[PDB]
């Protein structure tokens, strides 16, 4: 494994074993009035500012310099160029990795197999916009002449999470668009509950699937089509209510979808990096194409920042190395994402796939098994709610949990003259402050006494009211959560994930870890039919199956 | 500082560092045809069966024997009795812990300092039912005479999560109840977007708050009240549109809500254990009281199972110790909860509070600092959805992640003649099998050769196709997800949490870790006012506040 052999990494490791343990945030802040200044970065996008404050982290100039040396010696910069230049860095699949090309507004050429990719990219974007305009304008009618009122996206992986998260995040910008629904789970209640609120005459289904062979999506699509034709009665009417987003023309046609109703993307577009491609059709339909182009632009802006900025002032690089520090030196298993924005309620879930499916690996690009930790477990819920659910464990638990706090300065809903947002911001600020500062035995004791506690209560409560603090957090504050800023925020993390993948020398763009489950599932499906017990598996799988056959009857 | 010195704990520890890394699930099943039989328990509740299959765990009779010795060695049973008996086991607050009283269907007496609590418990249940009856029948009219069509629950944390999770999970049983909304975040966006869809004339607001002073809920409540009073203007109309669930009568009255409109509970009802009390009013309104009683009965059934079952056959006890095993011996930081049911999409979020806010502690009951791990980080998403998001990391990542897979045998929507559910069950089964069995290099190699891949391509890809397996999981299968069954499942985990807290000797029923953030938030709140720079905090908090003030009016 490259990482553990790297001299910059080893130097980092020994420093941690002989210093890291004594690092204390409160102390660091008390002895360096320039800490915020030295450990924060402000980005002016001309469309809002983004403040990345990483000063509340367990680091020093020395640690940062070492972390940055490591990034450099692991070839982060060269790796980045190869990605942008269209090289097939996805080594196990021999594929290019060009999600940056999907939002390359500069249209600077990017050649893969001797051919520039942009023309195809823009071609689909035009197709998307033209189609979106017709549906939005009402020009596009159903099989009964009615205009489309509901758009239903049926997809699962990177074919669901992104479009769902962004549409939720940008609701304030969906003024003139139809209602968008998202169906993904094979679980029947999902599609059933949806179709129950729809009129086939005014419903448009979007079959989103890179491969167009995923069982859940195809089954859901077929179910939606059956339900539809039950009323439309003429297979020819399908061309007015079903479109597909995929890279597989054959499967699409085989499904029965008109080829002009196919918005394609490419193999170098990873599912978990696809919302920027045709997969984002439901977004464009929801917020309009202008807002969608803003989304792409924001990501493009971030891509430029990542590409042209020296490492020491490079946002995604800084976040990545801060993560490496906690994962590989402090051994923290998780990474919490806590946005203080109800609209971003699906932000954390999106990066569970983005981050975990990318770096949840254990084999390097050379074929060697890692002998160090890789991708963390990403989780989180919107602020303040989380404060009333799990922060208890973050503040007084036994796990070190790196936290990323995000919040827009300006709210999309300044009700009560900004009272609500003022309180939201106060909590956002106070939480990272509290995690950092903590509360000593003495401070607690004085509070208890001042509060008028009796010698008994105080003595009883004292130890329980002590906060050891020293809990690291990142504070990412942006002027406003607009399509452009959101676009830049997502791209920022996409690049953080990329950097970490390079440091660990793993392929952040394949996902072989999903094959085993799929194949075993294919084996079990036919065995479930009938009441005959099964015994071709281990005793657990057999036992579970037999219980299912038995209880299938129970009334 | 109690568990680490327990004879059984140390014996358990020594065994692990001596054998722990030797355990291999695949080997354990390959050498014991009775494994499933010996490491699983079936529960017939008379209202459905629940199969807890814990055979795919890294354990043997010996390990389970030692784990159970630790359970009784730490006084789990005496502790259990104290809770049910009404003793003040919530030591730091000197309170009883009686959520089991809330659903005590047998009405056996349970006396707290003075009287038997059952009388007041049933008194509120009767009141809830009568009100619920009036609201659903249409008897209870809005201020202009219309029947109420929307019920808006306003609460946070324990006052929002249980209600939301249960109503989401029991959607199939609502037929007839008004639509229910849940407002919780202070973030203005939450109440703003909720109110924009309501008619003041037919909306009924439920202010859920145990203390009735939390800032988010009261603020949200005032905003709603103003909103309403903006179109009705008559303050006296409020009595037909606002009710309260709380233990604080004075504050409820001060808020402007009449007594008759207050559904109370008591201090021995922990917020994260309150959906069983008046807090469940929105659940009752949504699915009817018959179903609500069914929900309570299910919990009550599990309560009895927990109290009368020998430890080795006690479901919550087994789940608790397996957790202790992975937490304290394998050092696993997290617990994944993966229900293969879209209706349970909020189940994991619910227990993030129930578990994490309960056991995310570091001070024992004696006041000593723990020198071992406590509560884990709970997380998850409904399957198969997850299978396409983060399972990659669970299968080929670098972290051990204990996983609880849950699923109903019978679906609420058997569409397409059960095809969707069949596939859902197939994946449910195949995933734990895959996590267990893995796929060796030899197996992967055969596979690649059969695919006709040249030696070069084959060997470059081979290591990436290997699944080391040996990933432990629990499979919980129940006949159907009915109100009764959900209730038992929730109570089952409540008790798993109780047992673990007992073993760690922490107070699973207080939550002092949330106080610091609240104190600090009130401090900076007024400081946000004005354009003048703040310099009273650490440079980061100051820098963040000043960035906010600067961008507050940026265009
Ligand atoms: O869009 P598709 O091709 O149907 O993929 C479903 C999802 O599952 C995966 O193939 C693996 O889980 C993803 O990478 C993808 O986003
Ligand atoms: O408004 P309430 O019902 O008093 O409670 C606030 C919620 O937040 C907490 O106080 C702490 O997170 C919970 O214990 C509780 O359920």
How would you describe this structure to a colleague?
The structure is a homodimer of 555-residue chains. By secondary structure, chain A is an alpha/beta fold. Chain A has three domains: 1-98 and 294-514, Rossmann fold; 99-293, Rossmann fold (3-Layer(aba) Sandwich), CATH 3.40.50.10490; 515-555, Phosphoglucose isomerase, C-terminal domain (Orthogonal Bundle), CATH 1.10.1390. Chain A has 23 helices and eleven strands. In chain A, the strands form two sheets. Chain A has a six-stranded mixed β-sheet with strand order 1-2-11-10-8-9, sandwiched between helices. In chain A, strands 4-3-5-6-7 form a five-stranded parallel β-sheet, with helices on both faces. In chain A, helix 13 (281-287) packs across helix 14 (289-308), helix 15 (315-329) packs across helix 21 and helix 16 runs parallel beside helix 21 (483-504). The longest helix of chain A has 22 residues, at 483-504. The radius of gyration of chain A is 26 Å and the shape is globular. The termini of chain A are far apart. At the A-B interface, helix 3, helix 4, strand 2, helix 10 and helix 11 of A face helix 2, helix 3, strand 2, helix 9 and helix 10 of B. It is classed as isomerase. The entry lists the keywords emzyme -substrate complex, isomerase. The assembly is dimeric. The entry is titled "crystal structure of rabbit phosphoglucose isomerase complexed with fructose-6-phosphate". Chains A, B: phosphoglucose isomerase. Organism of A, B: Oryctolagus cuniculus.
């Amino acid at each position: 494994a490259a990482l553990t052999r790297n001299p910059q990494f080893q130097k980092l490791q020994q420093w941690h074993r002989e210093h890291g343990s004594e690092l204390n945030l409160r102390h660091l802040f008390d002895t360096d009035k320039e800490r915020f200044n030295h450990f924060s970065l402000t980005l002016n996008t001309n469309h809002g500012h983004i403040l990345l404050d990483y000063s509340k982290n367990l680091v020093t100039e020395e640690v940062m310099h070492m972390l940055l040396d490591l990034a450099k010696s692991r070839g982060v910069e060269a790796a980045r160029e190869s990605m942008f230049n269209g090289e097939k860095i996805n080594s196990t699949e021999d594929r290019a990795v060009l999600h940056v090309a999907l939002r390359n507004r500069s249209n600077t050429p990017i050649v893969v197999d001797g051919k520039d990719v942009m023309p195809e990219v823009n071609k689909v974007l035009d197709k998307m916009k033209a189609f979106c305009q017709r549906v939005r304008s009402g020009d596009w009618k159903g099989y009964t002449g009615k205009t489309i009122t509901d758009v239903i996206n049926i997809g699962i992986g990177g074919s669901d999470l992104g479009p769902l998260m962004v549409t939720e995040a940008l609701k304030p910008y969906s003024s003139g668009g139809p209602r968008v629904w998202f169906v993904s789970n094979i679980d029947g209640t999902h599609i059933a509950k949806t179709l129950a609120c729809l009129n086939p005459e005014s419903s448009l289904f979007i079959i989103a699937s890179k491969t167009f062979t995923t069982q859940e999506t195809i089954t859901n699509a077929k179910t939606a089509k059956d339900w539809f034709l039950l009323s439309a009665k003429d297979p020819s009417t399908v061309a007015k209510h079903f479109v597909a987003l995929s890279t597989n023309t054959a499967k699409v046609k085989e499904f029965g979808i008109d080829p002009q109703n196919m918005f394609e993307f490419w193999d170098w577009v990873g599912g978990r990096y696809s919302l920027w491609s045709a997969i984002g059709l439901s977004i464009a339909l929801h917020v309009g194409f202008d807002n969608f182009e803003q989304l792409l632009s924001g990501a493009h802006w971030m891509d430029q920042h990542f590409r042209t900025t020296p490492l020491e002032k490079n946002a995604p690089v800084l976040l990545a190395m801060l993560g490496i520090w906690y994962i590989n030196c402090f051994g923290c298993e998780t990474q919490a994402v806590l946005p203080y924005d109800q609209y971003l309620h699906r932000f954390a879930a999106y990066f569970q796939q983005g981050d975990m499916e990318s770096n949840g690996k254990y084999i390097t690009k050379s074929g060697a098994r890692v002998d160090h930790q890789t991708g963390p477990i990403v989780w989180g819920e919107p602020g303040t709610n989380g404060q009333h659910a799990f922060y208890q464990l973050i503040h007084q638990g036994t796990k070190m949990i790196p936290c990323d706090f995000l919040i827009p300065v300006q709210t999309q809903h300044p009700i009560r003259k900004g009272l609500h947002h003022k309180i939201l911001l106060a909590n956002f600020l106070a939480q990272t402050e509290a995690l950092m500062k903590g509360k000593s035995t003495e401070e607690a004791r004085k509070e208890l006494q001042a509060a008028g506690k009796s010698p008994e209560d105080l003595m009883k409560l004292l130890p329980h009211k002590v906060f050891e603090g020293n809990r690291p957090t990142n504070s990412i504050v942006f002027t406003k959560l607009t399509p452009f800023i959101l676009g830049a925020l997502i791209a920022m993390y996409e690049h953080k994930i990329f950097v970490q993948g390079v440091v660990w020398d793993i392929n952040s763009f394949d996902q072989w870890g999903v094959e085993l489950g799929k194949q075993l599932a294919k084996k079990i499906e036919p065995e479930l039919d009938g009441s005959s017990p099964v015994t071709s598996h281990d005793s657990s799988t057999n036992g579970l199956i037999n219980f299912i056959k038995q209880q299938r009857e129970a009334k």
